[PDB]
Design a protein around this ligand. Structure first.
Ligand SMILES: *[C@H](O)[C@H](CC(C)C)NC(=O)[C@H](CC(C)C)NC(=O)[C@H](CC(C)C)NC(=O)OCc1ccccc1
Ligand SMILES: [Cl-]
Ligand code: NA
Ligand code: NA
Lengths: 297, 300
């Protein structure tokens, strides 16, 4: 038993992290096969500014070994450096783009050296609530599936409120952000309803049951409450995804929605759920299944 | 900026995990050089898990009764010995992925990363703390025994915990890597319970300093307190006593923020009397006690 914010084992990703230096800027790159991927602002009109640069301007260090750059190109907001050596530690991988509400692990790195791992959710306003200091640009987000690494995030900047924004590995930003020193702010965020419900199921599976009640609701009635408290809408697809947790616990989703409705309207009356005094929304339904059934990689 | 329960990257530990089977019992082992370390209850026969005589059981085993698998490879056991509650299997091949490592026994309040594993394979990584009652609040299912806890400050892996059991409140107990249990527990299924747990006061203070470093001030006050008056209050909320060692340890965060340690203690006193009134600190509506003063400096 027990329930913790759990990240994927990071070893497959650790073997791909390198240090990239251009002039006096140093940040992290992802070495896969014979290409190194990193944020394009390492060269700081990127188009005009990339043509001036040449191959030996980019210093790539894998541990204590230098890679030689034999080509470079830009794709959206990511820089791609072709190197003369394929990474022998390249795992099975693919590039994916995730949706708001989905979770992933972040490997936070400095000077090409991994330093910590934590689990995050892509917020509805397309930020992540991470922990990043100077030099973390190029740190990466990922999920693991059977034996495949899905890379989904690369860090580019911190916003004034202290949250973080980045791109997918194809260089497209998540959210309404740009990579340059202009005034930018995180939009109003909302709570990921389907994830809160999944975490309430986790609580039940772990014996924390006090918030359960005899009542049920309708998707319509509950969504009018959700809107009222800045909760994301709950769709029929969301209901269906929670189906395995409903069957395992005996609590139908709209029965659990009645519990969540009361928690919103009335609060926690001084109690906690799974050691938290707030409603947690960074576990997906799949995260709860995986942790409570012991999936391995 | 930002403050997150960060775990250490787990790759150096992943390369050491193996599966160990004896009879019908399978659990995880830790393969370092030519030794596999695992919990000694892998030898326990299904019948007597209440009062097993582990010394008697082990002498009756042959090397070939122990099946050790690394990935798709079977390792040959060529000897065995027991050290306290840990079984040490000598194998005929040194692990080529062995990192720089040491074994350390930690004190209550210290934090570490757990790599939870099943059948020799990693499932996930998370941060834990050794509670004052010598349990940890982990996430462990059947087959997780032999998963380890570790820190990786500056490229050397310090192994501090190996998982053995779950107690009735749903908390977890285990040993150091020399096989000595943390706390009064034994690796038998006789009735056992953890003591009343308490809050790790020095870690709460470290986290309030982290909050101040991240721009939060709303809980500060103009008061100061004596160490003695603070401990008399803390007691009544089941908080651990604060010692002069803890005060010394908070010195650097006190310097970085300009807030004296006993000034911050008076803030904590007030929080214990009022609650948070629907406010949060570093994204939490509870006082967090599983970040050490060291963790705060590492991250800030
Ligand atoms: C090893 O993978 C496994 C991990 C658990 C998290 C499931 N550990 C055990 O099975 C362990 C073996 C014994 C010989 C150390 N047993 C326990 O952890 C056991 C709980 C199991 C049966 C779920 N705990 C236990 O026996 O605690 C003592 C006790 C007995 C009776 C009443 C209260 C406490
Ligand atoms: Cl310690
Ligand atoms: Na209900
Ligand atoms: Na004060």
């Amino acid at each position: 038993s027990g329930f913790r914010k759990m990240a994927f084992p990071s070893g497959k990703v650790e073997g791909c992290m390198v240090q990239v230096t251009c002039g006096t800027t140093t940040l992290n790159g992802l070495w896969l096969d014979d290409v190194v991927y990193c944020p394009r602002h390492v060269i700081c009109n990127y188009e005009d500014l990339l043509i001036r640069k040449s191959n030996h301007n980019f210093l790539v260090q894998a541990g204590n070994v230098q890679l030689r750059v034999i080509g470079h190109s830009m794709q959206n907001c990511v820089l791609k450096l072709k190197v003369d050596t394929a990474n022998p530690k390249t795992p099975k991988y693919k590039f994916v783009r995730i949706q708001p509400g989905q979770t992933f692990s972040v490997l936070a790195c400095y000077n090409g050296s991994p330093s910590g791992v934590y689990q995050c959710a892509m917020r509805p306003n397309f930020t992540i609530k991470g922990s990043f200091l100077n030099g973390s640009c190029g740190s990466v987000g990922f999920n693991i599936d059977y034996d495949c690494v899905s890379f989904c995030y690369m860090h580019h900047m911190e916003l004034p409120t202290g949250v973080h924004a980045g791109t997918d590995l194809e260089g497209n930003f998540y959210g309404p952000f740009v990579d340059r020193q202009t005034a930018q702010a995180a939009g109003t965020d909302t709570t990921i309803t389907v994830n809160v419900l999944a975490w309430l199921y986790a609580a039940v599976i772990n014996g924390d049951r006090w918030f359960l009640n005899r009542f049920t609701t309708t998707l319509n009635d509950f969504n009018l409450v959700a809107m009222k408290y800045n909760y994301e809408p709950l769709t029929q697809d969301h209901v269906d995804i929670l189906g395995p947790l409903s069957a395992q616990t005996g609590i139908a989703v709209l029965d659990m929605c009645a519990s969540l409705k009361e928690l919103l309207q009335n609060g926690m009356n001084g109690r906690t759920i799974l050691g938290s005094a707030l409603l947690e929304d960074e576990f997906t339904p799949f995260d709860v299944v995986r942790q409570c059934s012991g999936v391995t990689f």
